Amino acid sequence: GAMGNKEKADQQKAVTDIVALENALDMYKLDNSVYPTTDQGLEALVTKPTNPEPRNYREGGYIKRLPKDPWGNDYQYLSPGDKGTIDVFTLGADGQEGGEGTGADIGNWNIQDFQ
Amino acid sequence: GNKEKADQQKAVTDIVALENALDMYKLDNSVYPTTDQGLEALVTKPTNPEPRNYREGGYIKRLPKDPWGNDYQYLSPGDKGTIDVFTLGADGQEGGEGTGADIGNWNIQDFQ
Ligand SMILES: [Ca+2]
Ligand SMILES: [Ca+2]
Ligand SMILES: [Zn+2]
Ligand SMILES: [Zn+2]
Ligand SMILES: [Zn+2]
Numbered sequence: 001g002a003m004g005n006k007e008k009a010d011q012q013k014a015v016t017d018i019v020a021l022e023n024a025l026d027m028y029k030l031d032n033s034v035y036p037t038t039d040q041g042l043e044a045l046v047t048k049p050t051n052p053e054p055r056n057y058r059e060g061g062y063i064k065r066l067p068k069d070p071w072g073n074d075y076q077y078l079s080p081g082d083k084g085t086i087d088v089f090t091l092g093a094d095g096q097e098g099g100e101g102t103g104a105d106i107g108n109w110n111i112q113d114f115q
Numbered sequence: 116g117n118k119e120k121a122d123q124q125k126a127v128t129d130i131v132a133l134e135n136a137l138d139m140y141k142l143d144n145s146v147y148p149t150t151d152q153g154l155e156a157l158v159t160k161p162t163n164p165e166p167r168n169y170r171e172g173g174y175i176k177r178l179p180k181d182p183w184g185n186d187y188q189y190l191s192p193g194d195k196g197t198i199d200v201f202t203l204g205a206d207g208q209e210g211g212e213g214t215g216a217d218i219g220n221w222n223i224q225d226f227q
Contacts, residue, residue: 008142012135019131022227023124030120108227115134115220 007102010070011114014090014106017067021045021075021088022108024062031056035079035086042066042077042088071095083109119214122182126202126218127226129179133157133187133200134220136174143168147191147198154178154189183207195221 024045029035032054036044040051045062048054069075069090081087089107092099099105106114136157141147144166148156157174160166181187181202193199201219204211211217218226 003142005139005142008139012138016131016135019127019227023128026124027117027120030117111227112224115131115223 010093010102011104011106013070014092015111015114017069017075018088018090018106018108018111020063020067021077022086025077025086025088027058028054028062031058036077038078042075081109083107122205122214123218123226125179125182127223129181129187130200130202130218130220130223132175132179133189134198137189137198137200139170140166140174143170148189150189150191154187193221195219 021042025035025042028045036042036049040049043049043066044054046066047061048057067075071090071093073090073095076087076089076091078087079085087107087109089105089109091097091105092103093101094103096103097105104114133154137147137154140157145168146164146166148154148161149164152161155161155178156166158178159173160169179187183202183205185203185207188199188201188203190199199219199221201217201221203209204215204217205213206215208215209217
C-alpha cells in the first residue's frame with residue numbers, strides 16, 4: 001500500500017532531528033576544533049564533556065535538548081564515522097542495522113533518499 | 116564565522132522544513148502546490164485548484180524568511196529536481212560563492 005501520514009511523519013522527524021544534531025555537532029567543532037568523540041557522544045552537545053576537555057565550550061551547550069527518534073530510542077553517533085567524518089543516524093523501526101521501509105536506517109549520509 | 120555558519124544552518128533547517136511540508140501536502144492532496152500557489156499553500160488553504168484533502172491548520176506553523184530577510188524560492192516542477200526549494204544566498208541572485216552561494220534542496224549535502 002502507498003505510504004500514509006504516520007510513516008511519512010516519522011521519516012520526516014528522523015530527517016529533521018539528524019539535521020539539527022549535525023548542525024549542533026558542526027557548531028561544536030567550529031568552537032572546539034574537533035568533533036566530540038564517539039565516547040563523549042551526542043551528550044557533549046548538552047553537557048560540557050571531558051577526556052578531552054573542550055577548548056571553547058559554548059555556555060548553554062549546542063542544542064536545547066537531545067531528541068529521541070520516532071521509536072523512542074536515542075539517536076546514534078560515531079566519530080570518526082564509517083560513512084562520513086561523523087555518522088548521525090537512527091536504525092529505524094527494527095532497531096537493527098539495515099532493513100527497509102519503516103525499518104530503513106536513516107542517517108546523515110543517506111538523507112537524499114528520505115528528503 | 117559563527118554568524119555565517121548560523122546563517123547556513125538556518126537555511127538548511129528551513130529548506131528541510133519547507134520540503135517536509137510540501138511532501139506532506141503532496142501526500143494529502145496528490146499534487147504539489149503549483150509554482151503560482153507557492154509556499155503560501157502550506158499555511159493558507161489555496162484555491163484554483165482548491166486541494167481535495169487539505170490538512171486542518173495547514174502544513175507548517177509559519178513560513179520562515181531566509182537568513183538575509185528574503186523569501187525562500189519555490190519551483191514546481193523544479194529545474195534542479197522534481198521540486199526546487201531554495202535561498203539565493205547573501206547576494207539575492209542566482210549563482211555566487213561564499214555567503215552568496217545558493218542553498219537548495221538539490222545541494223543540501225554540500226551544506227549539511
Ligand atoms: Ca534498521
Ligand atoms: Ca546567490
Ligand atoms: Zn554523501
Ligand atoms: Zn522530499
Ligand atoms: Zn555538517
